[PDB]
Design a protein around this nucleic acid. Sequence first.
RNA 1: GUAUGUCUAAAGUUAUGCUCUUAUUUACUAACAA
Lengths: 137, 67, 103, 140, 424
Amino acid sequence: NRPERIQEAIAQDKTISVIIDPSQIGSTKPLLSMKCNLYIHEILSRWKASLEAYHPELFLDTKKALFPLLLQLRRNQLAPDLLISLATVLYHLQQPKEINLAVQSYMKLSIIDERTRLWITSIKRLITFEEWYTSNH
Amino acid sequence: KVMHQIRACKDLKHIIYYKFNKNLGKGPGCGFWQPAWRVWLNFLRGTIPLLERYIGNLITRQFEGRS
Amino acid sequence: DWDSRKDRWYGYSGKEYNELISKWERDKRNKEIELMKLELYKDSVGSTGEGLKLNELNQFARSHAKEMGIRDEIEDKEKVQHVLVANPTKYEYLKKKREQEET
Amino acid sequence: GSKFISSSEDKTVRIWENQINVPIKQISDTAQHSMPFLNVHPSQNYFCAQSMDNRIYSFSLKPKYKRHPKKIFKGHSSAGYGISLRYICSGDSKSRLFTWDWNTSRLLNNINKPITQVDWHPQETSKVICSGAAGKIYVC
Amino acid sequence: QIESVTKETVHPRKSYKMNSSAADITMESVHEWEVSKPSLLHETNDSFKGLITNKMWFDVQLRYGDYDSHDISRYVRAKFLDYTTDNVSMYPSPTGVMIGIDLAYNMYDAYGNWFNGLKPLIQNSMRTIMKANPALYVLRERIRKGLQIYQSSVQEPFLNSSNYAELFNNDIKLFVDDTNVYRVTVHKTFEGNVATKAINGCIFTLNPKTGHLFLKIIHTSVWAGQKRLSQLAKWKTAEEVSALVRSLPKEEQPKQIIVTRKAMLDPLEVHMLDFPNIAIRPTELRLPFSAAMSIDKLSDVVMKATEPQMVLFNIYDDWLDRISSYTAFSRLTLLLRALKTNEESAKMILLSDPTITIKSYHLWPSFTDEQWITIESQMRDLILTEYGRKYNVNISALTQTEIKDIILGQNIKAPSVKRQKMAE
RNA sequence: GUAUGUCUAAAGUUAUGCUCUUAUUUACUAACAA
Ligand SMILES: O=P(O)(O)O[C@H]1[C@H](OP(=O)(O)O)[C@@H](OP(=O)(O)O)[C@H](OP(=O)(O)O)[C@@H](OP(=O)(O)O)[C@H]1OP(=O)(O)O
């Protein structure tokens, strides 16, 4: 029951390529979802190291804000208009020389809206940390 | 011209209350709606012709064009 | 005192409100599987400032100005050296290389 | 390549920049326009255009804001088209083509045979194509 | 001992709907509370009967009194035991709390049931809010304006040429200009009179520390909806800014927002009521950001814009890399200033050397620091030249005065200037 | 800023002395800024 949900999931959690194809957005769905969903998990883990350097208080709730996405992404509850805008942010976030393109993509994502704000805003902190993380490294 | 009716009602209230509140103190709890009601009935009597004409012409215009 | 006389409710214990509570207190008496886990597997399982350094540089603007062209010169110094202090970005280097010599 | 012009059925012409999507200049109202063609003008100042009212116009396209016509090419009962190289040659609705001195607005009036879409063979100095209705293309 | 403080989302109507009321806040408890019998705030002897509640509710009840209905307590009590004991718009519990604010008299009061040791908190809360809620302060100020009795008294001084230094201080900020939101193509008509048509514009939204110039490019589609567009420009501006602020996190929500156009502050105040912590700063010093949009690539991007989109940039990139932000900003200020004086001159200065090349990302041409210095000097000369031309007194300038002149911000009538001057 | 007035809003009716370059005026207009 729950043990095989631990086994299958944690095994699947360590079984992915942390890559977003910028052309596969045109294709129709769980592949881009879980690519992003587990790319975010790497953005989580890189945070987890330098939590003493960075301010940890906001991250503790960032976690709770991210929990919706996790539930959206592994299910594909997240809408195409959101997802295309979302994956566009995460792809530009991969390359260190797309920091303009990162927040560019985030602003066009943001621009019903009660926890959506909360989590989308939480994604900006993920860019904010990552942009700083690559600088102070 | 309904001000007359309104005024009449006011007058009635003033009359009624102060025959209704001799030993009784002040407050809102008086009923007795008869004479005012009479006033309103007579106002309606007055106006029933007026509205038959007015609304008559109105709906005629809605149906037949205006002359 | 108008709104006191108007006061639809005035001069009462809550005899009608106690009857509402009585009517509702009676009504009191009368009456995920993996995805939860799939997300929570990751950690959560609960369920003045730098303008002072400008203000120092603007105080260093007082130094070069106090050296050459304060008041005596109308245009030749106090306006020319005025153009050559505080305004241009080069004045960062003028202080920076004085810091580097001071180091 | 940059600036771009497009007249319309409401008798208005519009100088634009290539991609800006903001009128550099809307043209005057009381005229009419149909066919827009730039004269191969040595300075390349000139944007010519045929009208409804039998009169091809000229426009100082550099600057785009300039638009005072110098001299107008009258006498071609228009429902058609016109093209330049010295000379401007445009056809008319009724009868036949009309060569015109671009400097003075007057020259020979060659027979067509109706229709009218004139053009010049630009690799050569003197050769025209007329476009008659129903397989009657005339060359000079 | 509160389990959850949830807001029951009602229609927008509720705010001002008076025949009924859904409860604004619903209060899920941890344990059963034993609330007192309904009473007013200042009614001290709150009677704790045996009745209990697992859940309370808080309702606000705004009112605008008259010379006759100018007691609030009675009214709020009426409201409380009207909506409770009415079979339209039922609250989850019939036991709850109701606040009401007489906006015409600043006479707060509240009636309803009381959890033990709650009343003092509520009293204090109301006292605080009344002393200074943002929205209520705005309202009072609005009314005050309406009566032309506005006492020109600000707590925080304006950005004058002296306080320019203390603009930025390891503190997250934002900077706003609404000048090029409503741009127009002037074109003739058939009738002969002028017809103004909207063009795409911008929301100059700069951050002096990071140099991150946000600017939401205003697509002309947003004007196509409505008329009276000069006011609407302000509204869309403030709206957009507000939205942006909302989007960013509590850390990256900028503290002090500076505004170029002091007229555009008025609606911003309104759209900043979403979040009270974001202080407003009316700049005394006018900064040239009308001419900011006449930078080549910026204007290009503006023209390019096809829809409601933002395209942020780093207004200075290489400069950050070389030197602190303030230094960069001074240069930028000079540049924009020069542009404002004359665009042709500015461009000429920039493109005096054709060998230099503007980098693909960067808005400006990447110069070496000595040639950069020279360029800056030239620009300054341009500004001074302009001053000489127009103002006709650019020769006999004092140091601070000269500095002010560069900005063009420190006005002669501005008392801040008198202050700084007085100090020296 | 308006009254007001036009415009669009999709389905196919069966025929064989001049050109030029500019700078200046004046006027009018301009819910565009001051
Ligand atoms: O005289 P009016 O302007 O018509 O107003 C009357 C009057 O109030 P004022 O004396 O304050 O004007 C009555 O008061 P009294 O003269 O009887 O003291 C009062 O009657 P009650 O005292 O019986 O209430 C009545 O109020 P209501 O309509 O509630 O009966 C109220 O009429 P308005 O409320 O319409 O002003």
